[PDB]
Amino acid sequence: STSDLIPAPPLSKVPLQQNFQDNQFQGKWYVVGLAGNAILREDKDPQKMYATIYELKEDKSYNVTSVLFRKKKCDYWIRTFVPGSQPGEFTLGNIKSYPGLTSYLVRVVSTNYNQHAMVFFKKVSQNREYFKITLYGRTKELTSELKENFIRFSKSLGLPENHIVFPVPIDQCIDG
Ligand SMILES: [Cl-]
Ligand SMILES: [Eu+2]
């Protein structure tokens, strides 16, 4: 394999939501925007919206379930976000169960809990460093202002426009 990636930003360029409220962040979020060094706009076959549900466990980790519509079916992808060094950061539980994965970080960049969130992810897999930012909405649509803010923020982390995608709203799988 050969591979050329935009470098992950230093974490000093990634804000952390002040006074993160883990209980209020729970529930379903729609992925309204998606950007990252391995994310590519594809006009031919556009990315479909998917959803990610955060459930706070008794131990204060999250069970995180993502639901995607692929090949006419609902695909479920489950992981555990374990609280990290400060509130609003997380690491991946059971990292040994993911082959090639040596590092995984989540940082909630901003949210008002009941409409929108921006979340930064960074991982090292097969020794390659990937990062993405998701724009989450409690609904499938968000204002132009929030989408443009997400574009500006993604660009501030070094991502050009073709690495920034707005998944198309769908009704299958993600409406339950
Ligand atoms: Cl608007
Ligand atoms: Eu992933």
Is residue 147 within a helix (H) or strand (E), and if so which, with residue range?
helix 144-156
- 65 annotated to bind ligand: no
Its sign, for the CA torsion 26, 17, 20, 90, is positive
Is residue 80 within a helix (H) or strand (E), and if so which, with residue range?
strand 73-83
Structural domain total, the chain: 1
Distance 77 CA to ligand 2 centre (A): 9
Interatomic CA distance for residues 56 and 124, integer angstroms:
25
Ligand nearest to the CA of 144: 1
* Residue 31 three-state SS: strand
Interatomic CA distance for residues 35 and 135, integer angstroms:
8
The token duo for 23 is 């209980």
* Residue 22 three-state SS: coil
Q: How was this structure determined?
A: X-ray
CATH number for position 114: 2.40.128.20
- 38 annotated to bind ligand: no
Beta bridge pairs of residue 124: 103, 129
Is residue 35 within a helix (H) or strand (E), and if so which, with residue range?
strand 27-36
Interatomic CA distance for residues 148 and 165, integer angstroms:
12
Q: Which domain holds residue 29?
A: 1-176
Interatomic CA distance for residues 156 and 60, integer angstroms:
32
Distance 171 CA to ligand 2 centre (A): 22
- 51 annotated to bind ligand: yes
- 104 annotated to bind ligand: yes
Interatomic CA distance for residues 136 and 113, integer angstroms:
10
b/e 95-110 (16+ beta carbons within 10 angstroms → b): eeeeeeeeebbbbbbb
CA distances from 163 to 19, 31, 39, 151 (A): 30, 15, 5, 10
